[PDB]
Write a protein that binds this ligand. Structure first.
Ligand code: SF4
Lengths: 371, 72
């Protein structure tokens, strides 16, 4: 039996829902709460939480989907590198997460690269890539590495092990991203929210400390939350009270898994190999200081250090008609998309939001939301 | 995202039990992990420990302070 049963008790969920309703009655206007975690959206939609909530309490879904926001340029670039490598005699084994594998671009996906005869393997984590590198010294093994802080930490750890053993056929195409900088940008570009449900797993890595500047700089109340429905319900309840009491602080509802300081070992490992840079967010634009690239001292671990390719200019981020940009910004839900459930489906997806496991569109589709 | 119980530890690798399914997990981010620990795993790596005992203690401590400040 998994510890912390109270956090997944249906009876507790009922009382929290009832409590939220009461607090909302005496709410002056409307409260808009945003979360930036696909797992949170999954919890929310799967348990019909938006339905259980008062009319004046809205849960907005932010860009909490690392694959969705991976730029087209990088995906196509990895494809060109695969071709150029082969042409130059060097054979490469490419690893990628399952959803990124089917991510569309105006010139094909990694699945198309596979069908053209390239060794493209689906992995569940960077340690898989590592073993593959071990078992194939004669080949250059590269993992197209996307992900927020929670996925970047294991990448950092594995790079640390590779550098010690001096593994030389183990590379990555870094498209790692930072979450807080994206929340800041959304705040400044128009997404309106009065409270934030900070991502629980990302917070495990960067701690409550990693989110504090947003409250000190923008005066917005935050709750670091777990992923059980009660974790989210609790976070919503707490944000409402803070909003009503005019408080501006961060509450660590996920105290059981998140230290205030975060995971220092992970943090140092990340700082050792990566450096912050401005970066593109598919369908959203360029967010300053929001991405990670390998430091010069470690250029040898980045596959791009070994192959210069030129990605065709002007590749559109999305297919015509896709509102994944509005969905990612929390400005619209998948049901506000004319294509949702018709032209666009997991089977025949139009945009990245429908392909990704963490995609808000896939999540809505998967749980039969017809709305 | 389900937590797992560490049943085996061998250097940087642990065997974690997730509802009867056992998988190998890297411990690089949680070096002091030991058999019996409950951990959260992401993409093959343990990222944090779950200590219900600790959590219950903090709760009781908090209640004791409030109970005392209120009159019980
Ligand atoms: S349903 Fe499809 S097409 Fe509409 S935004 Fe979501 S992914 Fe884009």
């Amino acid at each position: 039996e998994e510890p912390f049963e109270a956090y997944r008790s249906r009876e507790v969920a009922m009382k929290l829902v009832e409590k939220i309703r009461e607090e909302a009655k005496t709410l002056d206007g409307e409260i808009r709460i945003m979360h930036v975690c696909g797992t949170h959206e999954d919890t929310v939609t799967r348990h019909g939480i938006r339905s259980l909530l008062p009319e004046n309490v809205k849960v907005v879904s932010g860009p909490g989907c690392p694959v969705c926001i991976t730029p087209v340029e990088d995906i196509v670039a990895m494809q060109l590198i695969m071709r150029k490598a082969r042409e130059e005699g060097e054979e490469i084994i490419l690893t990628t997460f399952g959803d990124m594998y089917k991510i569309p671009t105006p010139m094909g996906s990694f699945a198309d690269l596979k069908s053209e005869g390239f060794d493209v393997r689906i992995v569940y984590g960077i340690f898989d890539t590592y073993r593959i590198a071990k078992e194939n010294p004669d080949k250059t093994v590269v993992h197209f590495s996307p992900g927020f802080e929670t996925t970047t930490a294991p990448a950092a750890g594995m790079l640390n092990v590779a550098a010690q053993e001096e593994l030389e056929n183990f590379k990555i195409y870094s498209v790692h991203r930072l979450t807080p900088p994206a929340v800041e940008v959304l705040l400044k570009q128009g997404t309106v929210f009065q409270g934030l449900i900070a991502p629980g797993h990302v917070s495990t890595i960067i701690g409550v400390k990693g989110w504090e500047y947003l409250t000190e700089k923008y005066g917005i109340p935050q709750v670091v939350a777990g992923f059980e429905p009660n974790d989210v319900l609790m976070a919503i309840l707490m944000l409402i009270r803070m909003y009503k009491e005019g408080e501006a602080r961060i509450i660590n509802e996920y105290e059981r898994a998140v230290k205030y300081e975060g995971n220092v070992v992970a943090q140092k490992m990340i700082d050792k190999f990566f450096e912050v840079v401005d970066a593109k967010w598919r369908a959203l634009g360029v967010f300053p200081k929001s991405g990670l690239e390998l430091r010069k001292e470690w250029k040898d671990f980045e596959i791009r250090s070994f192959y210069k390719v030129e990605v065709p200019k002007n590749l559109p981020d999305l297919e015509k008609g896709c509102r994944c940009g509005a969905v990612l910004r929390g400005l619209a839900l998948p049901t506000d998309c004319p294509l949702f459930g018709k032209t666009c489906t997991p089977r025949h997806p139009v945009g990245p939001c429908m392909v990704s496991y963490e995609g808000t569109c896939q999540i809505f589709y998967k749980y039969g939301v017809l709305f | 995202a389900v937590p797992g119980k560490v049943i085996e530890v061998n250097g940087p690798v642990a065997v974690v039990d997730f509802g009867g399914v056992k998988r190998e997990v890297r411990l690089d981010l949680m070096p002091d992990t030991k058999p019996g620990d409950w951990v959260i795993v992401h993409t093959g790596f343990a990222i944090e420990k779950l200590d219900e005992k600790k959590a219950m203690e903090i709760l009781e401590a908090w209640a004791e302070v409030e109970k005392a400040m209120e009159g019980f």
